[PDB]
Amino acid sequence: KLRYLNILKEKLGREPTFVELQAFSVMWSEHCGYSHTKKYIRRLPKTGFEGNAGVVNLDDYYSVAFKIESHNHPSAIEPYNGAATGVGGIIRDVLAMGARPTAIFDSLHMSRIIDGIIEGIADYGNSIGVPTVGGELRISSLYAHNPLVNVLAAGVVRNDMLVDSKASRPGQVIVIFGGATGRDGIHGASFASEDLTGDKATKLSIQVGDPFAEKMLIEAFLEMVEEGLVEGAQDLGAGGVLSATSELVAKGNLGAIVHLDRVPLREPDMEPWEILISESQERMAVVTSPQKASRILEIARKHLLFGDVVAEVIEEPVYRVMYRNDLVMEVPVQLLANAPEEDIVEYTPGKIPEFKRVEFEEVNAREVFEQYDHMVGTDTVVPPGFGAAVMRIKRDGGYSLVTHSRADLALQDTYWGTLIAVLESVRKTLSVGAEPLAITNCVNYGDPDVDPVGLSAMMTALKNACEFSGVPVASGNASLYNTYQGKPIPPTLVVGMLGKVNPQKVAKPKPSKVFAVGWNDFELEREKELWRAIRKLSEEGAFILSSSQLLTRTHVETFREYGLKIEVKLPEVRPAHQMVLVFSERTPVVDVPVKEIGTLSR
Numbered sequence: 025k026l027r028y029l030n031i032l033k034e035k036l037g038r039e040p041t042f043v044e045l046q047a048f049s050v051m052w053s054e055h056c057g058y059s060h061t062k063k064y065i066r067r068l069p070k071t072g073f074e075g076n077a078g079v080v081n082l083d084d085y086y087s088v089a090f091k092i093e094s095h096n097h098p099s100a101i102e103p104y105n106g107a108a109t110g111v112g113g114i115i116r117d118v119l120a121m122g123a124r125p126t127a128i129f130d131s132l133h134m135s136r137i138i139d140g141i142i143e144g145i146a147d148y149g150n151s152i153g154v155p156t157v158g159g160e161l162r163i164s165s166l167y168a169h170n171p172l173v174n175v176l177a178a179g180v181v182r183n184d185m186l187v188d189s190k191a192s193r194p195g196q197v198i199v200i201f202g203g204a205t206g207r208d209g210i211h212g213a214s215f216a217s218e219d220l221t222g223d224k225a226t227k228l229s230i231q232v233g234d235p236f237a238e239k240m241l242i243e244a245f246l247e248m249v250e251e252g253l254v255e256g257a258q259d260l261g262a263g264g265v266l267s268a269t270s271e272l273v274a275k276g277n278l279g280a281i282v283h284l285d286r287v288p289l290r291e292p293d294m295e296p297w298e299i300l301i302s303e304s305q306e307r308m309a310v311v312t313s314p315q316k317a318s319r320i321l322e323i324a325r326k327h328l329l330f331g332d333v334v335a336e337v338i339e340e341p342v343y344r345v346m347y348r349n350d351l352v353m354e355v356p357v358q359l360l361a362n363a364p365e366e367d368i369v370e371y372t373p374g375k376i377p378e379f380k381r382v383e384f385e386e387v388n389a390r391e392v393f394e395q396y397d398h399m400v401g402t403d404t405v406v407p408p409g410f411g412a413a414v415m416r417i418k419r420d421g422g423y424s425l426v427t428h429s430r431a432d433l434a435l436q437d438t439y440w441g442t443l444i445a446v447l448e449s450v451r452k453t454l455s456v457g458a459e460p461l462a463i464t465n466c467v468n469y470g471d472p473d474v475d476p477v478g479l480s481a482m483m484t485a486l487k488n489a490c491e492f493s494g495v496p497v498a499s500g501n502a503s504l505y506n507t508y509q510g511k512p513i514p515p516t517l518v519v520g521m522l523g524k525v526n527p528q529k530v531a532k533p534k535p536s537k538v539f540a541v542g543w544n545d546f547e548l549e550r551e552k553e554l555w556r557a558i559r560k561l562s563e564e565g566a567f568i569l570s571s572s573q574l575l576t577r578t579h580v581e582t583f584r585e586y587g588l589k590i591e592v593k594l595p596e597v598r599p600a601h602q603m604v605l606v607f608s609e610r611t612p613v614v615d616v617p618v619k620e621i622g623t624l625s626r
């Protein structure tokens with residue numbers, strides 16, 4: 025902050041004004057600026073080039089837009105609103121990609137089932153009519169003061185209706201529409217970067233959501249896309265108007281003139297800086313020509329929303345904020361969009377260590393989502409309780425969604441633990457017969473200034489694990505300064521993996537013999553052999569379970585849905601192993617260890 029305050033002063037050639045200080049505190053906060061993670065992120069193999077980030081072609085006609093986000097900070101302060109708006113936020117991300125939101129896969133890490141967090145997710149999900157197709161839940165006392173709420177959202181989008189994420193020429197205007205702007209979430213970006221949860225950020229920082237408006241938002245926006253009206257888009261989240269407008273024009277190397285007086289307000293006595301920095305929910309920024317702006321506003325207002333043309337895209341790369349004829353702030357756009365970059369730590373992996381059994385706790389979110397009329401994975405090819413969510417795109421087309429993490433391991437060795445989490449994400453995907461296509465990741469870390477190695481260790485293994493598996497990063501999020509009184513959370517990388525699968529080829533469980541396929545321990549040089557064995561057996565029609573516990577309660581519960589009973593003698597396994605459970609009529613034949621352990625019947 026201080027080091028940053030002094031650079032701004034360098035750059036500005038004076039001290040900032042009140043407005044500029046609120047502005048850069050937002051844009052230059054770890055949350056918005058990614059100071060510590062920008063360089064590590066660049067080294068990541070990405071689905072980048074592919075015009076649009078988070079967008080992955082499925083069959084040359086349809087693509088899957090997906091991304092995982094977090095709302096850890098706010099969820100610790102206000103479980104309900106923080107968790108709810110957590111989903112509201114990531115949903116708007118997939119919508120801005122041009123895709124109709126279709127699925128939500130949550131990844132929760134708490135010291136116990138925090139009602140408010142589970143209910144904020146269920147209510148908001150139910151009101152927007154977007155199903156939760158799965159959920160990863162980890163309970164550990166290590167997340168007591170900093171629960172982790174990571175939400176993955178995915179959507180189907182036509183390859184010929186991809187929306188851009190930037191402004192492209194002088195003369196375009198930017199429309200802000202959706203719910204009216206208020207004071208909520210003001211400074212939440214900085215609140216979410218606060219080296220500590222017990223810092224000067226509180227209730228004035230958490231956003232309030234309203235799914236009814238969000239529902240209206242997707243309808244309005246998709247109709248805008250379908251009418252060739254949207255030439256660019258970016259949802260309003262952290263930093264609100266400021267963040268959306270500056271980045272949109274920043275990405276296109278253009279500038280902008282913002283008219284805050286044009287921002288539909290919910291609270292008319294707000295000051296100009298509050299309008300600029302407000303983080304009110306359910307809002308979207310649209311880049312377009314002056315001609316299409318009328319139809320856009322017509323559509324927005326017709327869907328019971330509010331909106332007006334707020335900014336003009338200019339050639340000069342300056343960010344000029346006006347309020348009527350008053351000049352509120354004026355700074356170089358690229359100054360605001362390029363927070364100071366931190367040098368990184370070169371991390372060289374050590375010997376794979378022997379992991380100790382770190383007692384954690386899992387639980388089928390479905391069993392916990394009933395209390396709040398929220399069904400998990402009711403419309404999927406096969407139950408997500410078996411390891412992966414499989415959704416239908418077409419009769420003979422589909423995709424899978426997987427959310428995995430291994431903080432229990434990473435806590436002992438961030439590199440290997442983290443790297444293992446991803447490989448295991450590959451096993452899950454392959455196990456349902458899906459082909460790994462891309463990853464969306466959420467980096468949840470502590471304080472990078474106090475511990476730079478742990479971050480590097482996490483980011484470098486994501487790189488290596490992507491290189492090893494050949495599965496690139498399509499999108500993602502970084503959440504740092506996830507601490508309390510300095511007490512850091514366990515380094516948790518959440519891997520969201522997208523796979524391609526034909527709904528017709530997905531196996532269902534039925535009476536069969538059970539075999540433990542693989543090794544009881546881990547060696548990087550045989551992982552691909554395990555994948556090969558899984559690919560072969562899946563092709564032959566085998567049902568396959570890939571779990572750290574080999575067989576979980578959720579599993580036993582899911583088999584119940586088929587009236588099937590499982591009786592086996594689980595092999596002794598280490599915290600990190602390379603073994604999968606295979607169900608078939610005959611003994612599996614692969615070049616990997618095979619042991620018959622029991623049966624599935626009734």
Ligand SMILES: O=CNCC(=O)N[C@@H]1O[C@H](COP(=O)(O)O)[C@@H](O)[C@H]1O
Pocket residue numbers: 055093094095096097098109110112113114209211212213214215216229231260261262263303305502503504
């Ligand atoms: O509603 C929009 N959500 C989008 C968004 O950008 N939200 C911002 O992220 C913070 C949580 O970050 P974390 O503690 O999870 O790292 C939250 O407080 C918002 O400022």
